[PDB]
Every structure is written in C-alpha cells, then in structure tokens.
Design a protein around this nucleic acid. Structure first.
Lengths: 105, 155, 76, 49, 43
RNA sequence: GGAGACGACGGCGGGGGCCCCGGGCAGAGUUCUCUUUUCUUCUUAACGGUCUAUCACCCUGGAAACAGUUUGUCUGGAGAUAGGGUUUAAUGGCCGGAAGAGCCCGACACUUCUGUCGGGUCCGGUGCGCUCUCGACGUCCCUUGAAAAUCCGCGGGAGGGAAUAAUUCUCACGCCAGGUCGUACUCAUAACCGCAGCAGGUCCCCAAGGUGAACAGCCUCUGGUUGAUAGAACAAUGUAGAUAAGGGAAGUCGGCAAAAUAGAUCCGUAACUUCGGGAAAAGGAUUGGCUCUAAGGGUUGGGCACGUGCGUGCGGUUAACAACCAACUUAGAACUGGUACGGACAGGGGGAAUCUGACUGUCUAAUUAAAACAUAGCAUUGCG
RNA sequence: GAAGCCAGAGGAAACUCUGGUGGAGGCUCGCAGCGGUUCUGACGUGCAAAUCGAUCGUCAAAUCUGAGCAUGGGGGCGAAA
C-alpha cells in the first residue's frame, strides 16, 4: 500500500479573509470522487487542515494533483475568485494560491 | 505608428504565425522603437509581445462517436454508403481466415496433436474452403481424432 | 565521436600529442560521469559510474592536458 | 525432430541472457581497470619511456 | 468568450488593474484597507 | 568480371514519418449545472560502434502413407522436410554524438546595459489508415524497356622483399592542401506572357481532423487573408436562384428547358448475341435513434529418471485447458420519435424500335466532333 | 470478374456440376488532370482580338505533360481538316 501527500496552500488569501479554508474543505469532501462516485472517501482519502491556511490530503489510490488543481479552480470559479486567484504548483505535490500580477493604475 | 515590421519580427522570434502575435496596444510607441530582433526578444521577455494560444479543435465528439460505433450504434442500412466490399474486403477476410487456419495447423503439428499426413490433408481442405473458422476446423479435427480412435479400437 | 571502453586506451589517447583539451560531464540523474577528450579527428568519451575513484581518475590523467568541468548551461 | 514454439522462445531467452551477462562482465572489467588505474598510467609512462 | 474563432488570452499574461481588484474584492466584502493591496501592487 | 545501369501494372510483408488511443508532470481554458474534464510541450541529426533483421548459400541426412508451403501453387533424389550454421540488406534496439542542445513551467532581478537561478522533458498501445522507402512474388509485350565518365574484385606472376634486420602492409593514429561562378526576392486574381497590377495561360515537391467507399461535396486546426469604388432605396425590364392549387405536353418545328431517378442491403431481371455480354436491364422490399444478443482473433504455458539452467532416455496428445491482451466488420432482436430516416451534401430517368459507323482513338486553335480520318482484318502490285 | 489454382460431388477415363481463390481487359461508374457536347445561357466598344457558368466526353491507355534535340516555304509536318 502506497500513500501520497498533497498540500494546498492558501495562506495569503486565508489571512486576507478572501479564501475560506473550511468551506474549501467541505467542498473537497463533497466533490472528490473515488471509483467515479462522490461521497466514497472512506479510508482511501483523508482531508485535514494543518493550519496557516493549508489543506493536507492523504491518498492511497492514484489521486492526482491535476485533479486537485481542477477542483481548486472549480471552487475559485464558484467563489468568483477565478479571475483574481491563481493556483501554481510550487513543489512536488504542493499547490499555492496567490494573486495575479497587479498593476497600479 | 506602423507595426508591420514589428509583427513580422515578433512572429519570427516566437516561431508562430503573424496571426498568433499579440502586440500591446497601450505601448505602441515602445513597440515601434524596437527595430531589431534583440529588442523584440526584450519586449517578449517584458511581456509586451506574447504568443496567443491555438484555437480549439476538440476530439470529444469524435471519441464519443467512436465508442458508439464500437458498441454497435450508427451501423444501419441508412448509415452505409459504400458497398460491402468497399467497407470490408472479401479478400482481406479470406487472407485473415487462411492465416488463422494455417497458424492453427502449424501449432497443432508442432505440438503433436495431429500428424504430418493429417496436417497436409487439412491444409488442402482449408485452402479449398472447407472450414469457415477456427472453431469449425477444431471440431473437424476432433471428429477426425474420434474416428481414428474408433478405427484403432475396432482393429 | 567515439566511445572508449578501455581505461588503458583512454590514458594513451589523453597522452597523445593531439589531445587539445578534456572535459568532465556529470549526470546525476543517470548517476554517471563522462570524460571527453578532444583530439584532431575524434572526440573520445569514456563513460563511468559516478564514484570517488572515478573523480580520482583526474590525478591519473596527464597534468599538461587541461581538464574543465562542464557547466550547467552552455552559454554562447 | 521439429522443435516447438516454447523451445524457440527458450533459445531466444538464452541468447538474451548471454548478451546481458557479457555486458555485465564488460562493465565489471572496466570497473576493475578503473580500480587499477594508477598502475596502468605507470605502465603506459614506462612503455613510452 | 469567443472560443469558436480564437482562444482566450491567459490571465497570467495580463496584468490585473488594482482598481478593478479593489472593486471586486470590495463587493465581495473584504476590507482591503486592512490588508494593504497598494503595497502588493507593482508599478 | 561486377557496379554505374534502368519498363509498366497488381496484390502481400518489413521500416521511418504522419494520423489515432491510454497513463503521468507542468501550464492554459470551461465551470448555472455536468465534466478525475478539453487543449498544449514531452524532441534527438549527420557521422560511428555494437547486437540483430526476407532472399539466398553451406553441413548432416535421404523423402510415397509424398511432403514443405503463399492471399495468390510453387519447390524437392539436379537432395526436399527437419536440425544446425554462413551471409546481401536498417529509415530496427542500445551506446557515443547528447543534454551541455532545443522545448515547457516557476521564482527573483531589471532606467537601460542586461539577465540570473531552480524543476522537468516520462511510460505504453493499436491499425485492410495516409505517405515515402525496401523486399520477395506475379502479370503483359509481333513493345523486352540508354550510354559514357568513374570505382572495385579476380586471373596472371613480372618485379620487389628479412635477421648490417627488412617491409613497395587497401590496419589505427598523426602532417599538408582544396581555386572560379551562381546564391536577395516573385513564381502569380499585382514581381512571367497576353499593349495593363488583364476572371486567360504557365513545369513540380510537402498535404492535418470529422462525415463518407473516397486527395467527392460540406464543416474545422496550423498557416494565410479579410484584397478586389462606396452609401441609400427596393419601380419596370433583365441576370442568377426558387415555389406554386386543378389538369398533366392541350405548349412548341421539335418535351428546348425544368421536373422526376439517383447511395447502400435484399428479391428479381426479357428479347437479342460474335456466348464474352445485354445488366445497375425491367419491376419490387427496406434504411433514423436507443438498448442488447451472437459470430468472426493474438500471445504465453505440459509430466518423470539421471548428469548437471541445459543434455539425454522415456512417457502424452481433452492445452478440447488456464492467464493476459486487442480491433473492426457482419448478422439477429426488443424498445422508441416521425410529415421527412442515403433527412444537408452527394447522387443512373427508364423502356420499344429504325438509320448509321465495328469497337477504344483522332481532326477543321477562333462558327461544322460527324456516316469524316485512323484502326485490327482482308486483297493486289514491285523488289534477291 | 479472363486465364491459372484449391476443395467437394460425379464420370472407366476425357470431361461435367457446385463452392471458393485469383485479379486480366486499348472493360466500366467516377475525383484531379486533358478535352470541348449542349444551353432561344452570361458576355458582345467583354475580365478576354475566343473569356465565364451549368451540363457533357475521357480518366491506366492510340492517357497528360516539361526540358534538350531534329524537320524550314518551290519547303516542312499532317490518325488528311
């Protein structure tokens, strides 16, 4: 049995009170699907908060960080933050949410 | 301000068509001051010139139609437009069947299920179109073995 | 380009008078080290597993032959 | 007698194993020469002398 | 969206205006003065 | 003596590239809802080394109860099958080249000068696909499908060669040299010709996705264009495209034009005939969607006794079994919408006769394409 | 769908019938190309001193085509107008 750890960092928007970590956790819990069906996590996938606006995921199946980025972008589009927040892979399995480049007008 | 030269140089630098070149409309003077490929590369690095992404051509409907045709949809008489030989040649069907039959006969002779004379006789039957498929050939082989065993038991 | 599999023949090639220069390429992903010597006709490459005595082969190579470590970026 | 497909595949596997064994022996011989590199350099210098 | 004819320019290639980000976050209900987007904005 | 050095067509097999499918990293787009989603990069040159790849050739042996064998019936006592080898042939695998390149992504710096530093560039599958190339076959000819420069092998044995060592070694490495002219750009609805920036004409190479038999028609990606005086109004008569109740050629010199037919599966098809055809003759039945069922494949793998993974001597043909993998056709059935089901596109009207020329072919560029000419066949004349 | 070939059923044999295989033809539908049949066609001081549209013939060869070369007016060449 192999395991994979994924980190979704949202420290800057979480401290700016733009991104809701608990709402994102609930969204991930209700949207991450195993064997083509949502609400089928069990002991395969565990989602928690490690603090400082971060969400931590243990997966024992072949869950992909591209799928996690896809669900994060879906959550941003629902929260109307898609045009202003960006998900960037910063390490192996770590995706950080950060602002796009801002020009002072 | 004319930017035909700058668009041409930007296309040559980015390695794309001129229809994929985007020039920043709010710094047309800064882009117009660029007369060399070095300055064009500088503007590309600074972000004043970018390469626009390709236009979408999805394959999702083609894949959906492929799975539908694989499970058997859209194969009806209203869907066929070429002749039966044009869709699937009888020569290709015959060549596949003969290769299957000869492969099975070679395998049986190598394994020792059938002997050399029965191999030759079945080879010429297969060439003479006695067997319609591998199951038919196997059933014929089994019947021949049963008749040979009955003859050996009688003798 | 030619590959040399014999340490003795590589030493003789490096001791040849037409050996202009030599370079060491380190491939950490493959965990190997390549010694490349530039002669008149051919560039000769000796491939070794990356190791301390593989590095120590430099002290066996001739001193008059210049040896350069290949940088990470081939800057023009 | 006429050999079978299993025997032919076994012969092919034997040839592949022989090639891999020869390659491994060559790599070990090169490693041993790298171990005895200094003696080789001294011998080459003596031969040139 | 005009995806029939052309692709959408990626958001990372376009610099977002500070005033528009200010307005959008302000309607979303974020006190932007407490977080200081002015220092975060480049020039 | 070989190479240079050679036709056209048909199917089959191998290889490269393109097309297609799956997983993974990164980026981008969509996100009312759905979509573990859709799309993009994931590349490897010449030159070499190494291991291999149809034909063919060699050795043992001697085959009827004839055998081997291709899609295609060729081969074999002039030695087949089998077993073991040798070789022509790479655009095959691995390695050097070569990751240091190129490409993709990210983080800082940055008046400019300018960049700097990180992370990756991976693993498979499929084929009556397209294109090029190679190979073995086959067909056709009252047609048999260049030459030379140049390069190599052999026959021959003239000369030249050794221990003061010799070497006149197509092996490896090393040394030296390689002049002249062309080279931009267009190759066409504006770079050529036609008096012109003229809807004409003018020789080629590369050629993506979907439907479909299909480089048909229609839609799309890369790459290109958006150039061909414009604005307003909507009379007659035009040019081009259409429809029309009832009748259905009454029209007209004349069914001119238009309409009707058309793909595919199945049933069925007369006279005449040079027996090859006529023939898709004629005349009929059907075709959408959805959910299923069935059929048609590939790879791998047998028990003992000894010697020690192979050699034997045995024993057996229910492997008629298991595991894994894979693509497209064909047939059958239920359900279901309907005015349409080859729903656009695409796409024979058919038949009874006569005259006429045997047929395929050719000509009056710019008014006549034909019973004209030619053709195969036949007959005559002249020439040793 | 011609030879050639395979199998089965017969026939004393020569042959006959049936099912396949095969892929021949100055055969055939038809894309490009080549050509130029028809239309009270367009055009008629035209886009054009022969063009445009639809339709049509042919499409594996007596097919199409480039360059080099040969034949020169009392001539040449001519599937002959």
């Amino acid at each position: 049995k192999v395991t994979k750890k994924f980190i979704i960092n949202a420290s800057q928007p979480a401290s700016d009170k733009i991104f809701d970590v608990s709402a994102f956790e609930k969204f991930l819990n209700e949207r991450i699907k195993v064997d083509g069906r949502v609400g089928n996590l069990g002991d395969v996938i565990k989602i928690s908060q490690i603090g400082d606006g971060k969400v931590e995921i243990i997966a024992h199946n072949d869950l992909s960080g591209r799928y996690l980025k896809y669900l994060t972008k879906k959550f941003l589009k629902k929260m109307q933050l898609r045009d202003w927040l960006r998900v960037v892979a910063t390490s192996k399995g770590v995706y950080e949410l950060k602002f796009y480049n801002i020009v002072n007008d | 301000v004319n930017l035909r030269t700058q668009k041409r140089l930007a296309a040559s630098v980015l390695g794309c068509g001129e229809g994929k070149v985007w020039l920043d409309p709010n710094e047309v003077s800064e882009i117009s001051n660029a007369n060399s490929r070095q300055s064009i590369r500088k503007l590309v690095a600074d972000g004043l010139i970018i390469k626009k992404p390709v236009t979408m051509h999805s394959r999702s409907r083609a894949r959906e139609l492929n799975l539908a045709r694989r499970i058997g949809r859209h194969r009806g008489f209203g869907k066929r437009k070429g002749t039966a030989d044009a869709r699937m040649p009888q020569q290709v069907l015959w060549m596949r069947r003969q290769r299957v039959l000869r492969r099975l006969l070679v395998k049986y002779r190598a394994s020792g299920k059938i002997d050399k004379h029965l191999y030759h006789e079945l080879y010429h039957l297969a060439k003479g179109n006695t067997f319609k498929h591998k199951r038919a050939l196997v059933e014929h082989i089994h019947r021949a073995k049963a008749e040979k065993a009955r003859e050996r038991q009688i003798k | 380009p030619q590959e040399v599999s014999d340490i003795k023949k590589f030493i003789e090639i490096c001791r040849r008078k037409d050996a202009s220069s030599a370079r060491i390429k380190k491939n950490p992903k493959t965990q190997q080290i390549k010694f490349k010597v530039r002669c008149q006709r051919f560039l000769y490459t000796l491939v070794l597993k990356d190791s301390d005595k593989a590095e120590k082969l430099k002290q066996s190579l001739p001193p008059n032959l210049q040896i350069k470590d290949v940088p990470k970026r081939n800057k023009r | 007698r006429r050999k079978t497909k299993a025997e032919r595949n076994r012969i092919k596997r034997r040839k592949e194993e022989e090639r891999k064994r020869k390659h491994e022996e060559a790599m070990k011989r090169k490693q041993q020469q790298l171990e005895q590199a200094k003696k080789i350099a001294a011998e080459v210098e003596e031969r040139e002398r | 969206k005009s995806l029939k004819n052309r692709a959408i320019i990626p958001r990372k290639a376009v610099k977002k205006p500070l005033s528009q980000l200010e307005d959008h976050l302000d309607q979303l209900g974020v006190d932007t003065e407490a977080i200081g987007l002015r220092a975060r904005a480049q020039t």
